[PDB]
């Protein structure tokens, strides 16, 4: 149930009804491919083997508005931390020996980590059985080999053009089969296992493959998978657009814009705020975000939608004198900031222009509306089903005296502006 | 005929002679691949069929300075709007039944859209004819199948690692043949058809492939192609760089920079302004932009190049006290902002340093010049043929008193600065 | 020997011990593939030849905080400059005729350039010998052809989906073999040759492939490779985070942040400063940067780490009143800016929370620490071995009176703030 409210007084809109899936952590696992140390259908194998030899060579060669408020993480530090351990002597042999008679196992490593290790491809035992004695005979060994070899080559290609770190994680790095099994064996809730299983492509996109080592006939890379420690909490998206006075004299106008646009998700008694809404992806009513790109705010930040002048949170805005027209396409409609001589319209498919916007900040829902045009820019609106509510209010920019209005404030708020205006009235 | 003028008084340059190709809209079409529901050269087919089976599985699994002034669109809303319709019951059967005896057809869909539908691959009729009865015989059916199957796999790979939305649109999604035919059948001018046909790679880059549905032996994805509703209008690129006073005392200097740099194209009586010049691509003298990343301004914005103090448009600038050196490589030359103790030079290939810049903002054309060096940074200049004109003028930063100069203004203009300076002179 | 110092007085840290590898220039070379003009195992060749024909068709069709202070280069201007020369009549024939009996040669071109030219694939002599007379016989010609043809197709695919410019440079554009030979024949020091040879993937990432021409049975593209004119100079990374007062009253607090974060490398008597630390890549203790994304500063910029109030350089800061919590993961630890009611902790793997941060800016090294948590955000810390030093000092934000503190300054410095504060004290 996606709904939306437009706030006329502050030229912003809030889309709600979303459920969260936030990456809160990482799950690291070691993926191994055992390699072989070597020297008509045979000539096919000859070629297939030469390519094997230089893929191995390649792998060996491989190892010789409010965004500015965010902190800075190190995205593959967990995975790299695991990799640095595989570089201890005999450490890959602990993995090697544990995966002797089994393809997947939980190996207790040295530094005090217990990682699910997984041998996805046993080229070693292939070459050292159905290859070594040669003897043409059957074509089925030729194609089974080309198949296993191809995975190797695709892994090698990805690592080389990406300097050993890839994202999203391909099906060559980790098949649907293996990923599903990995998902099934993680120390997580069932609600989490099913979430991941029904969204593997989103999972792959939030994952890393990290080339670790190729030592003692063994290729090891670490796959770093998202932990969704916050699921099914309410999320909402806040859209904002410039609110300006609409005097006919050019340059006599003042504007303010709510700078706190982005994604918001309830999270452990606070709210996770994602200023760069590209760090989140929406699947139906589920929104996948990453906590690394967020701020943790008091829940009172939401009072800025209902009352931007509330005493519990100092709502954030920027100020300018630059009244350009534009539109923001929301979840269930469109905000239009229309100023000057700009032609601003909304249209239906078969009927054309159905609404002409006058100067100021207005809004239209997506019911019956397919496109929106501001100046020379045509925006298609999203055709998501959901109810829209227009909340009438006096545009707050009307409450300010342009003679003492502080323009060109960026990292500002309702209070900071009040203090300045008052500071300006002190000069009398 | 590419020309260029440098304005000494404002440390900016304008490259003109370009012709426009602006994406103003979208053309949506439905691409279908009919699928089959199933169970030495045959063993080849066996493998080729197993890969078919899990590609289908993968697809099913798949479905379970002035940039801050821009508005915010929803780039694939038109395509997704078409997709939501294919999810109506029997709606893909309207497409299916219409493409019974033909590969391309204009199917009138339910929601009041008429989309060109296109069956690019008929795997269904391949498996259910030259495959089902099996019977080795000829190798030509093996390779014709691997070929058709490969397209499927490549489409599947792109959709999975991109969560069902790809751009640019590959030749696997849509061949040169099919694209050309699609281009040929669109309700557009010939000037537009030829523009697209002579720039398919640019077209592909401005296009989207959107995975829609895999229902009733049919795979459907929507290809979203650019409409160039503005062609062959004059475009010009504005380059800007910091203009500072050059006093020898550190920290006693003031700077201003024109913030209105970017691409400009004449468009329907106004001017389309593209602040993020990476949203535009130049092919020879043709410049491909996207109106979604633009502002619509009065044509008077161009008066800022000839006269930044003009009364018809309030030209935009920022102010600082930070006189670092740098260079901007233009279309036909280079702007050099040289301050402090920085070594700034221009050079020819075989002759080395030919010009040493003194402190301030200067310019050199690309005739005889191959490189430009500011400090430890070497820039190669573009070697495009075209005439360059140096327009002499007193640097306007000399007209300002540093004692009342407002520095650290970002979203500013000539007037805003005047009002502030005057506001500062009021304290006397 | 990577070390790190945290400065408590300014909430910043400096990681040192790094060695430089800066791209200072470009090395351009011409890569050619000679093409053929044409018309069971033969049917294999038939298919392989049809794909050849349309790859050629595709290629022919193909040719018809302080970042805002950076200048603007033109990244492939050197390579494109070389390309414009190959478009002179008979100019590719100079290359063609010179590569008659040899695969690599230094061809003196017209415009006064001498470029190493390299024929990596001779399809012409393949088709016009082991193909033309046909005659099935041996399978080894089939697979040797598919192999050579495949490279062609992969090159063609990359150029088409990238509009003729690719980066990083694939092994299909240029094999490890060819790249190593190219590296070996460049007019560079041995220290440089070995640097490149031990980091080909980094090299490929800093390279461009530029499709030039397909004329007279010859395909030519220009490969643009990095020149590392600065090697083995000391580099250091500066991390910064917001420093705020910690009064319990909301909105009564003031903050400052050092804006000069990024990479620093000693370079020719000055310092190269890279504000966008993503323009640099770290391999062990080697850091690869690009001078195009840098400023050239006096070496005195480093005094801001030991003494931000020094008289030799005006250290840069921004100011605000926005005391949000966050963390910056450094090379050997973590900076924590903890304000308001935010829960801030550091943890060990097997032991959990080991340190709770109080309000203000603090730091913890990576020894014994694996994760850091600020609010709802968990950051893994880097597990690099190296010594960390905590430098105690009074947080400088305590030296300022909030009543005359200038907040919302972005492009500011210690002096600019002093002048403003003093300017504010003038109103008495
Ligand atoms: C990603 S980021 O760059 O860190 C955001 C910075 C945005 N920002 C601005 C507005 N502003 C820019 O956006 N840029 C950068 C650009 F030019 F790219 F827009 C500025 C260059 C100088 N002065 C003000 C600039 C004023 C301001 C004031 C405070 Cl206290 C904090 C942040 C602020
Ligand atoms: C602003 O006005 C309020 C009146 O409500 C007053 O209390 C305050 O002192 C004034 N000045 C500032 C800087 O807030
Ligand atoms: C600035 O100077 C002009 C004089 O041309 C005057 O008209 C104006 O009132 C002054 N002040 C402002 C804020 O523009
Ligand atoms: C600031 O204070 C210093 C005192 O050290 C004084 O010299 C200076 O004139 C004052 N004002 C400015 C704008 O620097």
mmCIF file of N, CA, C and O in Angstrom, chain A residues 201-262:
data_model
loop_
_atom_site.group_PDB
_atom_site.id
_atom_site.type_symbol
_atom_site.label_atom_id
_atom_site.label_comp_id
_atom_site.label_asym_id
_atom_site.label_seq_id
_atom_site.Cartn_x
_atom_site.Cartn_y
_atom_site.Cartn_z
ATOM 1 N N UNK A 201 19.435 -11.191 -7.483
ATOM 2 C CA UNK A 201 20.106 -10.183 -8.294
ATOM 3 C C UNK A 201 20.420 -8.936 -7.479
ATOM 4 O O UNK A 201 21.474 -8.328 -7.655
ATOM 5 N N UNK A 202 19.512 -8.559 -6.584
ATOM 6 C CA UNK A 202 19.771 -7.457 -5.666
ATOM 7 C C UNK A 202 20.905 -7.847 -4.723
ATOM 8 O O UNK A 202 21.773 -7.033 -4.408
ATOM 9 N N UNK A 203 20.885 -9.100 -4.275
ATOM 10 C CA UNK A 203 21.925 -9.629 -3.396
ATOM 11 C C UNK A 203 23.273 -9.561 -4.101
ATOM 12 O O UNK A 203 24.234 -9.007 -3.556
ATOM 13 N N UNK A 204 23.338 -10.098 -5.318
ATOM 14 C CA UNK A 204 24.567 -10.056 -6.112
ATOM 15 C C UNK A 204 25.100 -8.641 -6.271
ATOM 16 O O UNK A 204 26.313 -8.415 -6.218
ATOM 17 N N UNK A 205 24.188 -7.692 -6.460
ATOM 18 C CA UNK A 205 24.562 -6.294 -6.631
ATOM 19 C C UNK A 205 25.131 -5.702 -5.355
ATOM 20 O O UNK A 205 25.976 -4.812 -5.406
ATOM 21 N N UNK A 206 24.690 -6.202 -4.209
ATOM 22 C CA UNK A 206 25.222 -5.698 -2.947
ATOM 23 C C UNK A 206 26.371 -6.560 -2.442
ATOM 24 O O UNK A 206 26.749 -6.470 -1.281
ATOM 25 N N UNK A 207 26.939 -7.380 -3.320
ATOM 26 C CA UNK A 207 28.004 -8.289 -2.911
ATOM 27 C C UNK A 207 29.338 -7.944 -3.559
ATOM 28 O O UNK A 207 29.392 -7.188 -4.528
ATOM 29 N N UNK A 208 30.410 -8.505 -3.006
ATOM 30 C CA UNK A 208 31.742 -8.388 -3.592
ATOM 31 C C UNK A 208 32.408 -9.749 -3.787
ATOM 32 O O UNK A 208 32.266 -10.648 -2.954
ATOM 33 N N UNK A 209 33.140 -9.888 -4.885
ATOM 34 C CA UNK A 209 34.058 -11.007 -5.050
ATOM 35 C C UNK A 209 35.493 -10.487 -4.960
ATOM 36 O O UNK A 209 35.891 -9.612 -5.734
ATOM 37 N N UNK A 210 36.264 -11.013 -4.015
ATOM 38 C CA UNK A 210 37.625 -10.532 -3.790
ATOM 39 C C UNK A 210 38.668 -11.624 -3.993
ATOM 40 O O UNK A 210 38.798 -12.527 -3.171
ATOM 41 N N UNK A 211 39.408 -11.519 -5.091
ATOM 42 C CA UNK A 211 40.494 -12.433 -5.412
ATOM 43 C C UNK A 211 41.510 -12.487 -4.290
ATOM 44 O O UNK A 211 42.103 -11.470 -3.941
ATOM 45 N N UNK A 212 41.724 -13.661 -3.717
ATOM 46 C CA UNK A 212 42.598 -13.708 -2.560
ATOM 47 C C UNK A 212 43.972 -14.270 -2.902
ATOM 48 O O UNK A 212 44.986 -13.590 -2.734
ATOM 49 N N UNK A 213 44.012 -15.501 -3.394
ATOM 50 C CA UNK A 213 45.285 -16.184 -3.525
ATOM 51 C C UNK A 213 45.208 -17.331 -4.524
ATOM 52 O O UNK A 213 44.151 -17.925 -4.719
ATOM 53 N N UNK A 214 46.327 -17.624 -5.174
ATOM 54 C CA UNK A 214 46.441 -18.832 -5.978
ATOM 55 C C UNK A 214 47.728 -19.552 -5.553
ATOM 56 O O UNK A 214 48.818 -19.282 -6.061
ATOM 57 N N UNK A 215 47.586 -20.451 -4.582
ATOM 58 C CA UNK A 215 48.728 -21.089 -3.935
ATOM 59 C C UNK A 215 48.503 -22.587 -3.764
ATOM 60 O O UNK A 215 47.424 -23.007 -3.342
ATOM 61 N N UNK A 216 49.526 -23.378 -4.095
ATOM 62 C CA UNK A 216 49.499 -24.833 -3.934
ATOM 63 C C UNK A 216 48.305 -25.483 -4.633
ATOM 64 O O UNK A 216 47.464 -26.110 -3.983
ATOM 65 N N UNK A 217 48.246 -25.325 -5.954
ATOM 66 C CA UNK A 217 47.170 -25.878 -6.780
ATOM 67 C C UNK A 217 45.764 -25.444 -6.353
ATOM 68 O O UNK A 217 44.791 -26.145 -6.622
ATOM 69 N N UNK A 218 45.653 -24.295 -5.695
ATOM 70 C CA UNK A 218 44.355 -23.821 -5.220
ATOM 71 C C UNK A 218 44.136 -22.334 -5.495
ATOM 72 O O UNK A 218 44.953 -21.494 -5.117
ATOM 73 N N UNK A 219 43.027 -22.014 -6.157
ATOM 74 C CA UNK A 219 42.611 -20.630 -6.329
ATOM 75 C C UNK A 219 41.546 -20.279 -5.299
ATOM 76 O O UNK A 219 40.513 -20.941 -5.219
ATOM 77 N N UNK A 220 41.793 -19.240 -4.512
ATOM 78 C CA UNK A 220 40.823 -18.818 -3.509
ATOM 79 C C UNK A 220 40.410 -17.367 -3.710
ATOM 80 O O UNK A 220 41.254 -16.481 -3.831
ATOM 81 N N UNK A 221 39.102 -17.131 -3.766
ATOM 82 C CA UNK A 221 38.587 -15.775 -3.683
ATOM 83 C C UNK A 221 37.509 -15.697 -2.613
ATOM 84 O O UNK A 221 36.808 -16.671 -2.346
ATOM 85 N N UNK A 222 37.396 -14.528 -1.994
ATOM 86 C CA UNK A 222 36.427 -14.315 -0.931
ATOM 87 C C UNK A 222 35.174 -13.635 -1.474
ATOM 88 O O UNK A 222 35.256 -12.592 -2.129
ATOM 89 N N UNK A 223 34.018 -14.238 -1.223
ATOM 90 C CA UNK A 223 32.759 -13.615 -1.605
ATOM 91 C C UNK A 223 32.117 -12.961 -0.385
ATOM 92 O O UNK A 223 31.865 -13.606 0.634
ATOM 93 N N UNK A 224 31.870 -11.667 -0.508
ATOM 94 C CA UNK A 224 31.392 -10.846 0.587
ATOM 95 C C UNK A 224 29.923 -10.525 0.369
ATOM 96 O O UNK A 224 29.577 -9.723 -0.498
ATOM 97 N N UNK A 225 29.057 -11.169 1.144
ATOM 98 C CA UNK A 225 27.618 -11.057 0.945
ATOM 99 C C UNK A 225 26.948 -10.196 2.014
ATOM 100 O O UNK A 225 27.346 -10.218 3.183
ATOM 101 N N UNK A 226 25.903 -9.453 1.623
ATOM 102 C CA UNK A 226 25.153 -8.583 2.538
ATOM 103 C C UNK A 226 24.408 -9.318 3.648
ATOM 104 O O UNK A 226 23.757 -10.327 3.388
ATOM 105 N N UNK A 227 24.520 -8.808 4.872
ATOM 106 C CA UNK A 227 23.619 -9.168 5.962
ATOM 107 C C UNK A 227 22.527 -8.105 6.091
ATOM 108 O O UNK A 227 22.826 -6.921 6.277
ATOM 109 N N UNK A 228 21.270 -8.523 5.994
ATOM 110 C CA UNK A 228 20.142 -7.609 6.150
ATOM 111 C C UNK A 228 19.594 -7.655 7.571
ATOM 112 O O UNK A 228 18.576 -8.288 7.837
ATOM 113 N N UNK A 229 20.279 -6.967 8.482
ATOM 114 C CA UNK A 229 19.934 -7.006 9.893
ATOM 115 C C UNK A 229 18.708 -6.188 10.254
ATOM 116 O O UNK A 229 18.261 -6.198 11.402
ATOM 117 N N UNK A 230 18.171 -5.473 9.268
ATOM 118 C CA UNK A 230 16.927 -4.729 9.433
ATOM 119 C C UNK A 230 16.005 -5.015 8.260
ATOM 120 O O UNK A 230 16.275 -4.614 7.134
ATOM 121 N N UNK A 231 14.912 -5.708 8.545
ATOM 122 C CA UNK A 231 13.935 -6.107 7.553
ATOM 123 C C UNK A 231 12.538 -5.672 8.002
ATOM 124 O O UNK A 231 12.231 -5.710 9.196
ATOM 125 N N UNK A 232 11.716 -5.238 7.045
ATOM 126 C CA UNK A 232 10.276 -5.033 7.237
ATOM 127 C C UNK A 232 9.915 -3.902 8.189
ATOM 128 O O UNK A 232 8.843 -3.911 8.780
ATOM 129 N N UNK A 233 10.808 -2.937 8.349
ATOM 130 C CA UNK A 233 10.475 -1.719 9.075
ATOM 131 C C UNK A 233 9.925 -0.711 8.068
ATOM 132 O O UNK A 233 10.232 -0.796 6.878
ATOM 133 N N UNK A 234 9.103 0.244 8.532
ATOM 134 C CA UNK A 234 8.544 1.235 7.605
ATOM 135 C C UNK A 234 9.599 2.157 7.003
ATOM 136 O O UNK A 234 10.438 2.707 7.721
ATOM 137 N N UNK A 235 9.555 2.315 5.687
ATOM 138 C CA UNK A 235 10.400 3.284 5.008
ATOM 139 C C UNK A 235 9.561 4.322 4.278
ATOM 140 O O UNK A 235 8.442 4.050 3.851
ATOM 141 N N UNK A 236 10.117 5.514 4.124
ATOM 142 C CA UNK A 236 9.453 6.545 3.356
ATOM 143 C C UNK A 236 10.466 7.384 2.587
ATOM 144 O O UNK A 236 11.606 7.572 3.027
ATOM 145 N N UNK A 237 10.051 7.858 1.417
ATOM 146 C CA UNK A 237 10.914 8.675 0.585
ATOM 147 C C UNK A 237 10.434 10.115 0.606
ATOM 148 O O UNK A 237 9.259 10.387 0.400
ATOM 149 N N UNK A 238 11.351 11.033 0.886
ATOM 150 C CA UNK A 238 11.033 12.453 0.909
ATOM 151 C C UNK A 238 11.599 13.152 -0.326
ATOM 152 O O UNK A 238 12.813 13.132 -0.579
ATOM 153 N N UNK A 239 10.700 13.758 -1.094
ATOM 154 C CA UNK A 239 11.060 14.511 -2.281
ATOM 155 C C UNK A 239 10.937 15.998 -1.978
ATOM 156 O O UNK A 239 9.971 16.426 -1.343
ATOM 157 N N UNK A 240 11.910 16.795 -2.413
ATOM 158 C CA UNK A 240 11.821 18.232 -2.186
ATOM 159 C C UNK A 240 12.144 18.990 -3.462
ATOM 160 O O UNK A 240 12.742 18.440 -4.391
ATOM 161 N N UNK A 241 11.722 20.251 -3.500
ATOM 162 C CA UNK A 241 11.854 21.100 -4.677
ATOM 163 C C UNK A 241 11.836 22.556 -4.207
ATOM 164 O O UNK A 241 11.314 22.851 -3.135
ATOM 165 N N UNK A 242 12.432 23.467 -4.984
ATOM 166 C CA UNK A 242 12.532 24.867 -4.553
ATOM 167 C C UNK A 242 11.205 25.623 -4.393
ATOM 168 O O UNK A 242 10.373 25.648 -5.304
ATOM 169 N N UNK A 243 11.036 26.252 -3.230
ATOM 170 C CA UNK A 243 9.879 27.095 -2.958
ATOM 171 C C UNK A 243 10.250 28.589 -3.035
ATOM 172 O O UNK A 243 10.992 29.093 -2.186
ATOM 173 N N UNK A 244 9.741 29.295 -4.043
ATOM 174 C CA UNK A 244 10.109 30.697 -4.252
ATOM 175 C C UNK A 244 8.894 31.625 -4.256
ATOM 176 O O UNK A 244 7.786 31.210 -4.600
ATOM 177 N N UNK A 245 9.104 32.883 -3.877
ATOM 178 C CA UNK A 245 8.074 33.882 -4.079
ATOM 179 C C UNK A 245 7.972 34.127 -5.584
ATOM 180 O O UNK A 245 8.881 33.771 -6.344
ATOM 181 N N UNK A 246 6.870 34.727 -6.017
ATOM 182 C CA UNK A 246 6.573 34.799 -7.437
ATOM 183 C C UNK A 246 6.300 36.219 -7.931
ATOM 184 O O UNK A 246 5.464 36.419 -8.810
ATOM 185 N N UNK A 247 7.010 37.198 -7.368
ATOM 186 C CA UNK A 247 6.969 38.571 -7.866
ATOM 187 C C UNK A 247 7.404 38.630 -9.320
ATOM 188 O O UNK A 247 8.289 37.888 -9.741
ATOM 189 N N UNK A 248 6.792 39.529 -10.080
ATOM 190 C CA UNK A 248 7.060 39.638 -11.511
ATOM 191 C C UNK A 248 8.403 40.305 -11.819
ATOM 192 O O UNK A 248 8.998 40.056 -12.867
ATOM 193 N N UNK A 249 8.872 41.153 -10.907
ATOM 194 C CA UNK A 249 10.206 41.737 -11.019
ATOM 195 C C UNK A 249 11.269 40.651 -10.864
ATOM 196 O O UNK A 249 11.251 39.889 -9.895
ATOM 197 N N UNK A 250 12.185 40.572 -11.823
ATOM 198 C CA UNK A 250 13.256 39.584 -11.759
ATOM 199 C C UNK A 250 14.265 39.970 -10.679
ATOM 200 O O UNK A 250 14.607 41.147 -10.531
ATOM 201 N N UNK A 251 14.720 38.981 -9.914
ATOM 202 C CA UNK A 251 15.742 39.205 -8.910
ATOM 203 C C UNK A 251 15.215 39.763 -7.602
ATOM 204 O O UNK A 251 15.990 40.050 -6.693
ATOM 205 N N UNK A 252 13.902 39.921 -7.497
ATOM 206 C CA UNK A 252 13.310 40.413 -6.258
ATOM 207 C C UNK A 252 12.754 39.249 -5.444
ATOM 208 O O UNK A 252 12.142 39.441 -4.389
ATOM 209 N N UNK A 253 12.975 38.037 -5.938
ATOM 210 C CA UNK A 253 12.390 36.858 -5.325
ATOM 211 C C UNK A 253 13.355 36.119 -4.415
ATOM 212 O O UNK A 253 14.573 36.189 -4.591
ATOM 213 N N UNK A 254 12.796 35.418 -3.437
ATOM 214 C CA UNK A 254 13.582 34.623 -2.508
ATOM 215 C C UNK A 254 13.095 33.183 -2.529
ATOM 216 O O UNK A 254 11.919 32.923 -2.757
ATOM 217 N N UNK A 255 14.006 32.246 -2.301
ATOM 218 C CA UNK A 255 13.666 30.828 -2.326
ATOM 219 C C UNK A 255 14.205 30.098 -1.106
ATOM 220 O O UNK A 255 15.218 30.498 -0.529
ATOM 221 N N UNK A 256 13.536 29.007 -0.748
ATOM 222 C CA UNK A 256 14.092 28.028 0.177
ATOM 223 C C UNK A 256 13.760 26.613 -0.317
ATOM 224 O O UNK A 256 12.724 26.390 -0.951
ATOM 225 N N UNK A 257 14.659 25.674 -0.043
ATOM 226 C CA UNK A 257 14.481 24.283 -0.429
ATOM 227 C C UNK A 257 14.792 23.396 0.757
ATOM 228 O O UNK A 257 15.833 23.562 1.382
ATOM 229 N N UNK A 258 13.898 22.464 1.077
ATOM 230 C CA UNK A 258 14.215 21.466 2.090
ATOM 231 C C UNK A 258 15.357 20.578 1.587
ATOM 232 O O UNK A 258 15.278 19.992 0.506
ATOM 233 N N UNK A 259 16.429 20.503 2.365
ATOM 234 C CA UNK A 259 17.628 19.807 1.918
ATOM 235 C C UNK A 259 17.653 18.367 2.387
ATOM 236 O O UNK A 259 18.555 17.620 2.035
ATOM 237 N N UNK A 260 16.649 17.979 3.163
ATOM 238 C CA UNK A 260 16.661 16.678 3.829
ATOM 239 C C UNK A 260 15.982 15.591 2.995
ATOM 240 O O UNK A 260 15.491 14.591 3.520
ATOM 241 N N UNK A 261 15.973 15.783 1.687
ATOM 242 C CA UNK A 261 15.405 14.786 0.800
ATOM 243 C C UNK A 261 16.229 13.516 0.773
ATOM 244 O O UNK A 261 17.439 13.545 1.006
ATOM 245 N N UNK A 262 15.565 12.403 0.480
ATOM 246 C CA UNK A 262 16.206 11.101 0.475
ATOM 247 C C UNK A 262 15.311 10.029 1.069
ATOM 248 O O UNK A 262 14.107 10.235 1.260
#
